[model samples]
Target chain A: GLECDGKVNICCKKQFFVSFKDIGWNDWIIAPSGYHANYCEGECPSHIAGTSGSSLSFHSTVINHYRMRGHSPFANLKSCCVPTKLRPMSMLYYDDGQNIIKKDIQNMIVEECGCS
Target chain B: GLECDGKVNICCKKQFFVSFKDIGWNDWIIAPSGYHANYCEGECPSHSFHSTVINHYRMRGHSPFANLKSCCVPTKLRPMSMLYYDDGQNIIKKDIQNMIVEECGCS
Candidate 1:
């Protein structure tokens, strides 16, 4: 069973892979066609459990607290599996003039995961 | 003393007073011109520091993660009661949800 799906809700780093060429973007984006990445998954505790490090922001804890109780005031808010850090990756793409551009894309890779 | 300094960045909740008149909202908010409404400030880590749950990334043009960046935000919050006048100029007192910040962190 996956982490968050179990009885004890836990925020975890699950496995994920990004493939650009597979998505039909192989035409413009030409490089290391894909990379192994991860995504934050699962649910945080219903109360104050995950506040320590499970989430990056305390706002998420509050939102989850309301949601678990079925409270609707914070209906607009949600606990998101977001990246805690980002890393750069190099890329070679075709610019407007069809020029092959070689550059490093900032914030290209997610290094860690957390709730917000 | 409390600001988003680039060199040494740490998500922190700084003090703030929400003044209704200072913000041009006194006409509607009948009482308590201002109160401390803490704000979060700091730069998110490019590398993992405090902690996280998972990770993911996309190819240059495909990943939505690129659009999402870690940011300084509140970690704990509480509520408060507010006094205001509605369209009918009727005085109303209500308890606002999650109106006060108690902790801060990176998210």
Candidate 2:
């Protein structure tokens, strides 16, 4: 398959999943075993060979450390895709005291897939 | 009226015009003396709760971009053409990149 083919640097949402059983959490998480924990992953054009947003949590820049090269052959650094915004998720799991705990976990849900 | 709201961090593109005459550059330039050269502004939401490239710019130290802030900035820019005089007093017309704003977003 071909790799990314775009003029601009790519950074957006991606389809991904994480299962409780996949991480040996099935025995602890009691309800709704798995959820849509999609992550963000995309080809971010190198600031070296590239040129170029959004009020919608989208933008790119030449990381200063990399820009410090002042036009060098070592500008392989690319932007990372991370969640710029996130929400909480309710989890039902067993605690160390053997009690069923259900509560909201902050920063658990991937609210937005953004370019870093 | 207020321009933008916070929490959402109000990263947006605003209408701004540029005049060569106003900047004292009109003496040599011709055509499209005035053009829209919009700009970007607004606050950026911290990446800790949800954010990090922005933070990478913030938390890091002892480097060039250290003081670099994670604020609203231009995500896209366009070019504009202008006819102007050169050092040799020659009339030249050409396009300049990063002359105009196209899109705005949190960076």
- For all predicted structures, in order, the TM-scores are 0.42, 0.39
Looking at chain B only, the TM-scores across the models are: 0.68, 0.68
lDDT of 1 by residue, A71-96 (tens): 55234334445454557778888999
- State the DockQ of every prediction: 0.06, 0.06
For model 1 chain A, where is the 10-residue window of minimal lDDT? A49-58
> In candidate 2, what are the lDDT values of residues A1-116, reduced to their tens digit?
11123553455544345456755668878966877654444554443222222422111222232334553322432344445455677888899996999988676556554443
Q: Which residue segments of model 1 deviate by more than 4 Å?
A: A1-9, A48-76, B1-107
| lDDT (tens digit, per residue) of candidate 1 on B1-107 | 23434455566666655566765668887766776765565556645312232222322343534554555655556777779998798999988665667777655
Off by over 4 Å in 2: A1-9, A46-53, A56-77, B1-107
Task: Please give the distance, in angstroms, between residue A54's alpha carbon in candidate 1 and its true position after superposition.
Answer: 5.5
**Over the stretch B13-51, how does candidate 2's per-residue lDDT look in tens digits?**
666665768756678777668777655555555543222
Winning model by TM-score: 1
